[PDB]
């Protein structure tokens, strides 16, 4: 499991505002945890907390 930007097809996330959106988003994969969280280097995302290992999370810089 892990802690990451969770992606979506090729290494995007959901641009979401509402952690508890993400806090069912997350765990709705099989998550222990979920929260949006933001940084820069992607922008926003869904930060999935141990999030299962079958979701391939994404980090490359930009979306694409």
């Known amino acids: 499991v892990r802690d990451a930007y969770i992606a979506k097809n090729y290494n995007c996330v959901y641009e979401c505002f509402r952690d ?17 969280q933001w940084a820069g280097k992607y922008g926003n995302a869904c930060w999935c907390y141990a999030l299962p290992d079958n979701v391939p999370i994404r980090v490359p810089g930009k979306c694409h």
Do not use: M, Q, R
């Open 20 to 36: 508890s959106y993400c806090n069912d988003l997350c765990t709705k994969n099989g998550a222990s945890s979920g929260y949006c």
